[PDB]
Amino acid sequence: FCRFTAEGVQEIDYKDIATLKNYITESGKIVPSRITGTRAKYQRQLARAIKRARYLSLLPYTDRH
Amino acid sequence: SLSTEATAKIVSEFGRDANDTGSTEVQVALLTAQINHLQGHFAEHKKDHHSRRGLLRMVSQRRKLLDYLKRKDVARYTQLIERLGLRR
Amino acid sequence: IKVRENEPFDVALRRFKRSCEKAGVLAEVRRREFYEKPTTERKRAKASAVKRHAKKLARENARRT
Amino acid sequence: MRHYEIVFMVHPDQSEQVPGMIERYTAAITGAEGKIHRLEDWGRRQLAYPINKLHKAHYVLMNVEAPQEVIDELETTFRFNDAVIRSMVMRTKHAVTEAS
Amino acid sequence: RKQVSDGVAHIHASFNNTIVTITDRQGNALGWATAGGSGFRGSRKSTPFAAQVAAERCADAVKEYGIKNLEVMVKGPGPGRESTIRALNAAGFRITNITDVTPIPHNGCRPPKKRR
Amino acid sequence: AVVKCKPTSPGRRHVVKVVNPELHKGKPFAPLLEKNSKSGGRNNNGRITTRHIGGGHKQAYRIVDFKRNKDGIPAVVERLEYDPNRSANIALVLYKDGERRYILAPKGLKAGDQIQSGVDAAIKPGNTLPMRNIPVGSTVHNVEMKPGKGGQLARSAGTYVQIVARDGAYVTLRLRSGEMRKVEADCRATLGEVGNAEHMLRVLGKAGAARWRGVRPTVRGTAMNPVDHPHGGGEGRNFGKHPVTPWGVQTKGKKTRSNKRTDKFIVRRRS
RNA sequence: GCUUGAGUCUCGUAGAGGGGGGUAGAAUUCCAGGUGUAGCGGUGAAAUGCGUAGAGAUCUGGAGGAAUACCGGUGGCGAAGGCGGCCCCCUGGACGAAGACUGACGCUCAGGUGCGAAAGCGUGGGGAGCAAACAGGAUUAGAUACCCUGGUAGUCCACGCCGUAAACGAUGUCGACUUGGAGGUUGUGCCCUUGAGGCGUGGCUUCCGGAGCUAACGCGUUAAGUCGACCGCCUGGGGAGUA
């Protein structure tokens, strides 16, 4: 039910990991849009950002590294 | 992929002015330039069937446009085919 | 995945395991791929889920309870 | 001529050399009529997972606007440099100079 | 016996059996006990009680090592996965922290077709 | 390219010729040529030591610069040449000082590419570098066993080795046979695979085609006599014996490796 | 001649669309070593199998092939088959805004051409896991099946061949009209973004349903309703989609 940049418009960035940690659980898994309430347009962009932060070792793939 | 500066040359060369972008002479030449540019893309990789159908669409689109121009005015049709180098 | 309950635990309280799967993905890839039944069992999953929602907005009968 | 966003990690033993690659790579871009937009060095920060050896590597953000033939040869210099670890290049998206 | 201070207790709770192995912090095993080694052959091997008695028979033969606090590594679904750690807490040990070490693949190798 | 021949006559129906158009059709570089007399399997004692050798077309040897010791001077490839003495093609390169040499032609090479050797050469196919200056995991060929030996591994057409590991002064390689081998890091190697990878797709077609390769007909042991071959004999195709060599050594599986001095450099045998 | 058909340009939007090349993580398998001990594995149960040559378990290091958990959603794209980790290059298709231009250039299409799941075939590689064939152990009166332990082809790659599917919303393509509601996805206009918005206008799509249709089930503005153009197909069942 919560909202995100669908209202406070900004482009999804893969570097500001402070906001990206709110959309991943403690295991590093991507939280679905059915829980956070984000739109599908930015959820797809968020998914690329999480995968990109995982590649650059800014966010963990999991906690079993 | 037929960028804006490439399209701006053809409309100013084949059309009456810079606004005559829809004429048959422009449309055939516009499609021909994309076909010849896509020849090098299909010179390689031998397997891009999805884009090849897109190439085959504008091949038939040029054929339909050329046959209309041939039926409409032969003088403009004969002038266009020698200008582009086609119609075996 | 990780749980501490630092000093005053005296019990597991390990609901963080079942908070993500703890059984769900490991009892799904231990067999039965088919490459097919994930399509069929998911088409009928939301087909019955929307009819439980269709009767959730169509239960307005008296029913004398 | 397209925008880009180059991010590369360097080995911590060459983190005293992390300024040294900056003038070598930007002059290769500006030598090919490429415009530089950012020199955002994040420093040596914690890694999320150990990459091929011990953690705590050094990050550099470039975010350049350069033609094609200079980006791919810069990528090959990242390949044959043992200090460079896991480089990547992004889309154009009208390269920005923000988001520290 | 070496008189070790701490250690790690790995639990391999498979579908048919539960393997409880107590190692040190460096992964060197100090002793183990399984549900199928504690009697219980057949259908009684895959039950939470057999996993519970596997920890009780793993509570001894270590201890000589003198372990006071330990970490629990839970792996596999298991018929137990909760009784084997409840008995470990009541065996005279200090359960510091618990993490899940289940080898969950990210769509890697192909699963079998068995058990139709 | 690979070309299938038409069945105009017997001995031609089953012929596939590997014709390669960019090979220079003229005479080769005369200063790099010298005679190469046929031996026919005979030795100083004049007895045949290696059977099924004799005849064949006359071929002159070409001096191929295997060592690649010209360091710091770039070389431009002039033309591709056909080498009858080897399975691969050879590239005639022209150095900047006017010296011409024959090298083993890599996979990706044309007439006009610039190559150089030494230690300061870049990572390019055709460039020769010591293996502590070549990245681990890259594919190299013309591999030396000793510092300055010349290059003895992966010289056939299409063959190559892979740099698997580099620990200290020794570099572990994956040989083309599938054998892990350790060599000195001071040795040089040429980057890339060897050209003419279509060699093994060539079918001879006829008996004669093997006859002018230098290969003589091979006689089966079963067709022989007991005085000639250990198999011999047979009143109506009788074998009844374990397959062996004509000198009694067992074949079809028998490890003949007995060296005891190069085994330290071998990590894993082939499978 | 003209513009509502069709088409082109200008500025943007979304997408697993296609091809080529690299790269990341988890997991499985294998090898070597360390710790460590009698079972491990499997089943309704058991055995084949593995293990005192020291297995299973745990840790470290290394080598390989395949596929991308979460995101992930009757979500999206593609004519169809089908396509999902990330990144570089090439490139196709679709949609929206308000303008500009050609001026019926349109629709369908026998023959013909191209694409075309998986299995399979030819050549050269690769092979981790899975797995026809096959072996052994179980069940059974019998079990050359379902069960278990293994395991070849194949599944993977490069180029060709094959052109076959319950290739199915079982509904051909194009065009016009005809109550509606509830949603998803993707543009865009106006008003106050005055506050997770309000009022409209387009493309795709899901469900329920009015009239109408149908033998009924059911379809129902993406119709199986009301009309036009064209192609293909059927004339009881078996024989047989066989010779």
mmCIF file with all atom_site columns, N, CA, C and O in Angstrom, chain B residues 36-74:
data_model
loop_
_atom_site.group_PDB
_atom_site.id
_atom_site.type_symbol
_atom_site.label_atom_id
_atom_site.label_alt_id
_atom_site.label_comp_id
_atom_site.label_asym_id
_atom_site.label_entity_id
_atom_site.label_seq_id
_atom_site.pdbx_PDB_ins_code
_atom_site.Cartn_x
_atom_site.Cartn_y
_atom_site.Cartn_z
_atom_site.occupancy
_atom_site.B_iso_or_equiv
_atom_site.pdbx_formal_charge
_atom_site.auth_seq_id
_atom_site.auth_comp_id
_atom_site.auth_asym_id
_atom_site.auth_atom_id
_atom_site.pdbx_PDB_model_num
ATOM 1   N N  . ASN B 1 36 ? 20.243 -1.349  -47.862 1.00 0.00 ? 36 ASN B N  1
ATOM 2   C CA . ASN B 1 36 ? 21.678 -1.454  -48.116 1.00 0.00 ? 36 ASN B CA 1
ATOM 3   C C  . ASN B 1 36 ? 22.486 -1.396  -46.826 1.00 0.00 ? 36 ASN B C  1
ATOM 4   O O  . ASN B 1 36 ? 23.518 -2.069  -46.712 1.00 0.00 ? 36 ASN B O  1
ATOM 5   N N  . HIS B 1 37 ? 22.049 -0.593  -45.853 1.00 0.00 ? 37 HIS B N  1
ATOM 6   C CA . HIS B 1 37 ? 22.727 -0.568  -44.561 1.00 0.00 ? 37 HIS B CA 1
ATOM 7   C C  . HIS B 1 37 ? 22.543 -1.886  -43.818 1.00 0.00 ? 37 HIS B C  1
ATOM 8   O O  . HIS B 1 37 ? 23.474 -2.373  -43.165 1.00 0.00 ? 37 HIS B O  1
ATOM 9   N N  . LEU B 1 38 ? 21.349 -2.478  -43.903 1.00 0.00 ? 38 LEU B N  1
ATOM 10  C CA . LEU B 1 38 ? 21.097 -3.765  -43.266 1.00 0.00 ? 38 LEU B CA 1
ATOM 11  C C  . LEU B 1 38 ? 21.736 -4.929  -44.012 1.00 0.00 ? 38 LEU B C  1
ATOM 12  O O  . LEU B 1 38 ? 21.727 -6.049  -43.490 1.00 0.00 ? 38 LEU B O  1
ATOM 13  N N  . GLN B 1 39 ? 22.269 -4.699  -45.217 1.00 0.00 ? 39 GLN B N  1
ATOM 14  C CA . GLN B 1 39 ? 22.987 -5.755  -45.923 1.00 0.00 ? 39 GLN B CA 1
ATOM 15  C C  . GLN B 1 39 ? 24.231 -6.188  -45.160 1.00 0.00 ? 39 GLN B C  1
ATOM 16  O O  . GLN B 1 39 ? 24.514 -7.388  -45.066 1.00 0.00 ? 39 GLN B O  1
ATOM 17  N N  . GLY B 1 40 ? 24.984 -5.230  -44.613 1.00 0.00 ? 40 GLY B N  1
ATOM 18  C CA . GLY B 1 40 ? 26.145 -5.574  -43.810 1.00 0.00 ? 40 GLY B CA 1
ATOM 19  C C  . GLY B 1 40 ? 25.787 -6.257  -42.507 1.00 0.00 ? 40 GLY B C  1
ATOM 20  O O  . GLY B 1 40 ? 26.547 -7.097  -42.015 1.00 0.00 ? 40 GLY B O  1
ATOM 21  N N  . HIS B 1 41 ? 24.641 -5.897  -41.922 1.00 0.00 ? 41 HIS B N  1
ATOM 22  C CA . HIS B 1 41 ? 24.168 -6.585  -40.725 1.00 0.00 ? 41 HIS B CA 1
ATOM 23  C C  . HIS B 1 41 ? 23.805 -8.032  -41.030 1.00 0.00 ? 41 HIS B C  1
ATOM 24  O O  . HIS B 1 41 ? 24.060 -8.928  -40.216 1.00 0.00 ? 41 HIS B O  1
ATOM 25  N N  . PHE B 1 42 ? 23.209 -8.279  -42.192 1.00 0.00 ? 42 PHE B N  1
ATOM 26  C CA . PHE B 1 42 ? 22.890 -9.631  -42.625 1.00 0.00 ? 42 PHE B CA 1
ATOM 27  C C  . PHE B 1 42 ? 23.991 -10.256 -43.468 1.00 0.00 ? 42 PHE B C  1
ATOM 28  O O  . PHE B 1 42 ? 23.866 -11.421 -43.859 1.00 0.00 ? 42 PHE B O  1
ATOM 29  N N  . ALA B 1 43 ? 25.060 -9.513  -43.763 1.00 0.00 ? 43 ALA B N  1
ATOM 30  C CA . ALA B 1 43 ? 26.267 -10.151 -44.271 1.00 0.00 ? 43 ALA B CA 1
ATOM 31  C C  . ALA B 1 43 ? 26.893 -11.031 -43.200 1.00 0.00 ? 43 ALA B C  1
ATOM 32  O O  . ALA B 1 43 ? 27.562 -12.023 -43.512 1.00 0.00 ? 43 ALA B O  1
ATOM 33  N N  . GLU B 1 44 ? 26.683 -10.686 -41.934 1.00 0.00 ? 44 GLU B N  1
ATOM 34  C CA . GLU B 1 44 ? 27.202 -11.424 -40.798 1.00 0.00 ? 44 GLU B CA 1
ATOM 35  C C  . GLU B 1 44 ? 26.062 -12.079 -40.018 1.00 0.00 ? 44 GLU B C  1
ATOM 36  O O  . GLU B 1 44 ? 24.881 -11.761 -40.199 1.00 0.00 ? 44 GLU B O  1
ATOM 37  N N  . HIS B 1 45 ? 26.456 -13.043 -39.180 1.00 0.00 ? 45 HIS B N  1
ATOM 38  C CA . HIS B 1 45 ? 25.683 -13.694 -38.123 1.00 0.00 ? 45 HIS B CA 1
ATOM 39  C C  . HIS B 1 45 ? 24.642 -14.699 -38.617 1.00 0.00 ? 45 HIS B C  1
ATOM 40  O O  . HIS B 1 45 ? 24.154 -15.509 -37.822 1.00 0.00 ? 45 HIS B O  1
ATOM 41  N N  . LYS B 1 46 ? 24.288 -14.662 -39.907 1.00 0.00 ? 46 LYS B N  1
ATOM 42  C CA . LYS B 1 46 ? 23.640 -15.759 -40.635 1.00 0.00 ? 46 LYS B CA 1
ATOM 43  C C  . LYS B 1 46 ? 22.357 -16.335 -40.022 1.00 0.00 ? 46 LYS B C  1
ATOM 44  O O  . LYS B 1 46 ? 21.830 -17.322 -40.545 1.00 0.00 ? 46 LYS B O  1
ATOM 45  N N  . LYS B 1 47 ? 21.833 -15.756 -38.937 1.00 0.00 ? 47 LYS B N  1
ATOM 46  C CA . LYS B 1 47 ? 20.750 -16.395 -38.190 1.00 0.00 ? 47 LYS B CA 1
ATOM 47  C C  . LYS B 1 47 ? 19.710 -15.425 -37.642 1.00 0.00 ? 47 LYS B C  1
ATOM 48  O O  . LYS B 1 47 ? 18.791 -15.863 -36.938 1.00 0.00 ? 47 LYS B O  1
ATOM 49  N N  . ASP B 1 48 ? 19.817 -14.130 -37.933 1.00 0.00 ? 48 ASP B N  1
ATOM 50  C CA . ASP B 1 48 ? 18.897 -13.146 -37.362 1.00 0.00 ? 48 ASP B CA 1
ATOM 51  C C  . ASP B 1 48 ? 17.599 -13.142 -38.172 1.00 0.00 ? 48 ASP B C  1
ATOM 52  O O  . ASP B 1 48 ? 17.342 -12.275 -39.011 1.00 0.00 ? 48 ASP B O  1
ATOM 53  N N  . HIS B 1 49 ? 16.766 -14.152 -37.902 1.00 0.00 ? 49 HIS B N  1
ATOM 54  C CA . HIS B 1 49 ? 15.543 -14.337 -38.676 1.00 0.00 ? 49 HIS B CA 1
ATOM 55  C C  . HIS B 1 49 ? 14.466 -13.325 -38.306 1.00 0.00 ? 49 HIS B C  1
ATOM 56  O O  . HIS B 1 49 ? 13.665 -12.939 -39.165 1.00 0.00 ? 49 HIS B O  1
ATOM 57  N N  . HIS B 1 50 ? 14.419 -12.895 -37.041 1.00 0.00 ? 50 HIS B N  1
ATOM 58  C CA . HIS B 1 50 ? 13.371 -11.976 -36.606 1.00 0.00 ? 50 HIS B CA 1
ATOM 59  C C  . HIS B 1 50 ? 13.524 -10.609 -37.263 1.00 0.00 ? 50 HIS B C  1
ATOM 60  O O  . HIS B 1 50 ? 12.540 -10.016 -37.723 1.00 0.00 ? 50 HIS B O  1
ATOM 61  N N  . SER B 1 51 ? 14.752 -10.090 -37.317 1.00 0.00 ? 51 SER B N  1
ATOM 62  C CA . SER B 1 51 ? 14.981 -8.824  -38.004 1.00 0.00 ? 51 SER B CA 1
ATOM 63  C C  . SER B 1 51 ? 14.925 -8.989  -39.516 1.00 0.00 ? 51 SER B C  1
ATOM 64  O O  . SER B 1 51 ? 14.653 -8.018  -40.233 1.00 0.00 ? 51 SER B O  1
ATOM 65  N N  . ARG B 1 52 ? 15.191 -10.200 -40.019 1.00 0.00 ? 52 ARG B N  1
ATOM 66  C CA . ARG B 1 52 ? 15.127 -10.441 -41.456 1.00 0.00 ? 52 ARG B CA 1
ATOM 67  C C  . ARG B 1 52 ? 13.710 -10.289 -41.989 1.00 0.00 ? 52 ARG B C  1
ATOM 68  O O  . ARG B 1 52 ? 13.519 -9.789  -43.103 1.00 0.00 ? 52 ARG B O  1
ATOM 69  N N  . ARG B 1 53 ? 12.709 -10.719 -41.217 1.00 0.00 ? 53 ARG B N  1
ATOM 70  C CA . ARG B 1 53 ? 11.322 -10.482 -41.604 1.00 0.00 ? 53 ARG B CA 1
ATOM 71  C C  . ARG B 1 53 ? 11.013 -8.992  -41.647 1.00 0.00 ? 53 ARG B C  1
ATOM 72  O O  . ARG B 1 53 ? 10.265 -8.530  -42.518 1.00 0.00 ? 53 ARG B O  1
ATOM 73  N N  . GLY B 1 54 ? 11.574 -8.224  -40.710 1.00 0.00 ? 54 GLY B N  1
ATOM 74  C CA . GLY B 1 54 ? 11.464 -6.778  -40.785 1.00 0.00 ? 54 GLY B CA 1
ATOM 75  C C  . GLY B 1 54 ? 12.136 -6.201  -42.015 1.00 0.00 ? 54 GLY B C  1
ATOM 76  O O  . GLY B 1 54 ? 11.647 -5.224  -42.591 1.00 0.00 ? 54 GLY B O  1
ATOM 77  N N  . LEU B 1 55 ? 13.261 -6.786  -42.430 1.00 0.00 ? 55 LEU B N  1
ATOM 78  C CA . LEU B 1 55 ? 13.878 -6.403  -43.695 1.00 0.00 ? 55 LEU B CA 1
ATOM 79  C C  . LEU B 1 55 ? 13.009 -6.828  -44.872 1.00 0.00 ? 55 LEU B C  1
ATOM 80  O O  . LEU B 1 55 ? 12.837 -6.078  -45.839 1.00 0.00 ? 55 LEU B O  1
ATOM 81  N N  . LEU B 1 56 ? 12.447 -8.039  -44.806 1.00 0.00 ? 56 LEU B N  1
ATOM 82  C CA . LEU B 1 56 ? 11.600 -8.527  -45.889 1.00 0.00 ? 56 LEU B CA 1
ATOM 83  C C  . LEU B 1 56 ? 10.298 -7.745  -46.006 1.00 0.00 ? 56 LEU B C  1
ATOM 84  O O  . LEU B 1 56 ? 9.689  -7.739  -47.082 1.00 0.00 ? 56 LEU B O  1
ATOM 85  N N  . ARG B 1 57 ? 9.855  -7.092  -44.930 1.00 0.00 ? 57 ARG B N  1
ATOM 86  C CA . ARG B 1 57 ? 8.650  -6.273  -45.007 1.00 0.00 ? 57 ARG B CA 1
ATOM 87  C C  . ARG B 1 57 ? 8.897  -5.014  -45.830 1.00 0.00 ? 57 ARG B C  1
ATOM 88  O O  . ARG B 1 57 ? 8.098  -4.663  -46.705 1.00 0.00 ? 57 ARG B O  1
ATOM 89  N N  . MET B 1 58 ? 10.006 -4.319  -45.562 1.00 0.00 ? 58 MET B N  1
ATOM 90  C CA . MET B 1 58 ? 10.320 -3.115  -46.322 1.00 0.00 ? 58 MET B CA 1
ATOM 91  C C  . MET B 1 58 ? 10.818 -3.429  -47.728 1.00 0.00 ? 58 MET B C  1
ATOM 92  O O  . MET B 1 58 ? 10.780 -2.547  -48.593 1.00 0.00 ? 58 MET B O  1
ATOM 93  N N  . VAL B 1 59 ? 11.292 -4.653  -47.972 1.00 0.00 ? 59 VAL B N  1
ATOM 94  C CA . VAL B 1 59 ? 11.589 -5.074  -49.338 1.00 0.00 ? 59 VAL B CA 1
ATOM 95  C C  . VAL B 1 59 ? 10.306 -5.139  -50.159 1.00 0.00 ? 59 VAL B C  1
ATOM 96  O O  . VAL B 1 59 ? 10.232 -4.610  -51.274 1.00 0.00 ? 59 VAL B O  1
ATOM 97  N N  . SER B 1 60 ? 9.270  -5.777  -49.608 1.00 0.00 ? 60 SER B N  1
ATOM 98  C CA . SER B 1 60 ? 7.980  -5.824  -50.286 1.00 0.00 ? 60 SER B CA 1
ATOM 99  C C  . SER B 1 60 ? 7.286  -4.468  -50.268 1.00 0.00 ? 60 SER B C  1
ATOM 100 O O  . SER B 1 60 ? 6.528  -4.151  -51.193 1.00 0.00 ? 60 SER B O  1
ATOM 101 N N  . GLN B 1 61 ? 7.519  -3.666  -49.225 1.00 0.00 ? 61 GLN B N  1
ATOM 102 C CA . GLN B 1 61 ? 6.957  -2.320  -49.181 1.00 0.00 ? 61 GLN B CA 1
ATOM 103 C C  . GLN B 1 61 ? 7.533  -1.446  -50.288 1.00 0.00 ? 61 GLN B C  1
ATOM 104 O O  . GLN B 1 61 ? 6.811  -0.653  -50.902 1.00 0.00 ? 61 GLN B O  1
ATOM 105 N N  . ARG B 1 62 ? 8.837  -1.569  -50.545 1.00 0.00 ? 62 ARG B N  1
ATOM 106 C CA . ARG B 1 62 ? 9.447  -0.856  -51.663 1.00 0.00 ? 62 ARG B CA 1
ATOM 107 C C  . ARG B 1 62 ? 8.890  -1.352  -52.992 1.00 0.00 ? 62 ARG B C  1
ATOM 108 O O  . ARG B 1 62 ? 8.658  -0.563  -53.915 1.00 0.00 ? 62 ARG B O  1
ATOM 109 N N  . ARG B 1 63 ? 8.682  -2.667  -53.107 1.00 0.00 ? 63 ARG B N  1
ATOM 110 C CA . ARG B 1 63 ? 8.160  -3.250  -54.339 1.00 0.00 ? 63 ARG B CA 1
ATOM 111 C C  . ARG B 1 63 ? 6.755  -2.741  -54.644 1.00 0.00 ? 63 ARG B C  1
ATOM 112 O O  . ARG B 1 63 ? 6.430  -2.431  -55.795 1.00 0.00 ? 63 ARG B O  1
ATOM 113 N N  . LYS B 1 64 ? 5.904  -2.659  -53.618 1.00 0.00 ? 64 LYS B N  1
ATOM 114 C CA . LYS B 1 64 ? 4.559  -2.127  -53.812 1.00 0.00 ? 64 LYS B CA 1
ATOM 115 C C  . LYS B 1 64 ? 4.596  -0.648  -54.174 1.00 0.00 ? 64 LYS B C  1
ATOM 116 O O  . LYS B 1 64 ? 3.813  -0.186  -55.012 1.00 0.00 ? 64 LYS B O  1
ATOM 117 N N  . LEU B 1 65 ? 5.494  0.113   -53.544 1.00 0.00 ? 65 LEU B N  1
ATOM 118 C CA . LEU B 1 65 ? 5.610  1.537   -53.847 1.00 0.00 ? 65 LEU B CA 1
ATOM 119 C C  . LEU B 1 65 ? 6.175  1.760   -55.245 1.00 0.00 ? 65 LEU B C  1
ATOM 120 O O  . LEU B 1 65 ? 5.745  2.672   -55.960 1.00 0.00 ? 65 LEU B O  1
ATOM 121 N N  . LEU B 1 66 ? 7.151  0.941   -55.646 1.00 0.00 ? 66 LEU B N  1
ATOM 122 C CA . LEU B 1 66 ? 7.752  1.087   -56.970 1.00 0.00 ? 66 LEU B CA 1
ATOM 123 C C  . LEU B 1 66 ? 6.758  0.736   -58.070 1.00 0.00 ? 66 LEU B C  1
ATOM 124 O O  . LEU B 1 66 ? 6.725  1.386   -59.122 1.00 0.00 ? 66 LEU B O  1
ATOM 125 N N  . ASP B 1 67 ? 5.944  -0.299  -57.850 1.00 0.00 ? 67 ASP B N  1
ATOM 126 C CA . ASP B 1 67 ? 4.923  -0.663  -58.827 1.00 0.00 ? 67 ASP B CA 1
ATOM 127 C C  . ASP B 1 67 ? 3.837  0.397   -58.948 1.00 0.00 ? 67 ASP B C  1
ATOM 128 O O  . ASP B 1 67 ? 3.274  0.566   -60.035 1.00 0.00 ? 67 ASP B O  1
ATOM 129 N N  . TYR B 1 68 ? 3.527  1.105   -57.860 1.00 0.00 ? 68 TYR B N  1
ATOM 130 C CA . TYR B 1 68 ? 2.580  2.212   -57.944 1.00 0.00 ? 68 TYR B CA 1
ATOM 131 C C  . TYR B 1 68 ? 3.160  3.367   -58.749 1.00 0.00 ? 68 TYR B C  1
ATOM 132 O O  . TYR B 1 68 ? 2.463  3.981   -59.565 1.00 0.00 ? 68 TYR B O  1
ATOM 133 N N  . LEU B 1 69 ? 4.440  3.680   -58.526 1.00 0.00 ? 69 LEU B N  1
ATOM 134 C CA . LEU B 1 69 ? 5.084  4.765   -59.260 1.00 0.00 ? 69 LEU B CA 1
ATOM 135 C C  . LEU B 1 69 ? 5.227  4.418   -60.736 1.00 0.00 ? 69 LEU B C  1
ATOM 136 O O  . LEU B 1 69 ? 5.090  5.286   -61.605 1.00 0.00 ? 69 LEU B O  1
ATOM 137 N N  . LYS B 1 70 ? 5.516  3.148   -61.036 1.00 0.00 ? 70 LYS B N  1
ATOM 138 C CA . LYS B 1 70 ? 5.602  2.706   -62.425 1.00 0.00 ? 70 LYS B CA 1
ATOM 139 C C  . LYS B 1 70 ? 4.260  2.855   -63.133 1.00 0.00 ? 70 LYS B C  1
ATOM 140 O O  . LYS B 1 70 ? 4.200  3.292   -64.288 1.00 0.00 ? 70 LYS B O  1
ATOM 141 N N  . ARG B 1 71 ? 3.171  2.504   -62.449 1.00 0.00 ? 71 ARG B N  1
ATOM 142 C CA . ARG B 1 71 ? 1.839  2.670   -63.016 1.00 0.00 ? 71 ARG B CA 1
ATOM 143 C C  . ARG B 1 71 ? 1.424  4.135   -63.083 1.00 0.00 ? 71 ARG B C  1
ATOM 144 O O  . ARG B 1 71 ? 0.714  4.531   -64.015 1.00 0.00 ? 71 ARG B O  1
ATOM 145 N N  . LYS B 1 72 ? 1.859  4.951   -62.123 1.00 0.00 ? 72 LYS B N  1
ATOM 146 C CA . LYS B 1 72 ? 1.475  6.358   -62.085 1.00 0.00 ? 72 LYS B CA 1
ATOM 147 C C  . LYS B 1 72 ? 2.212  7.166   -63.147 1.00 0.00 ? 72 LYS B C  1
ATOM 148 O O  . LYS B 1 72 ? 1.582  7.754   -64.031 1.00 0.00 ? 72 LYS B O  1
ATOM 149 N N  . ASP B 1 73 ? 3.543  7.202   -63.071 1.00 0.00 ? 73 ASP B N  1
ATOM 150 C CA . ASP B 1 73 ? 4.355  7.977   -64.012 1.00 0.00 ? 73 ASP B CA 1
ATOM 151 C C  . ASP B 1 73 ? 5.636  7.197   -64.295 1.00 0.00 ? 73 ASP B C  1
ATOM 152 O O  . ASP B 1 73 ? 6.469  7.016   -63.402 1.00 0.00 ? 73 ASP B O  1
ATOM 153 N N  . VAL B 1 74 ? 5.786  6.742   -65.541 1.00 0.00 ? 74 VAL B N  1
ATOM 154 C CA . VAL B 1 74 ? 6.970  5.983   -65.934 1.00 0.00 ? 74 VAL B CA 1
ATOM 155 C C  . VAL B 1 74 ? 8.214  6.861   -65.900 1.00 0.00 ? 74 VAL B C  1
ATOM 156 O O  . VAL B 1 74 ? 9.306  6.394   -65.543 1.00 0.00 ? 74 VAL B O  1
#
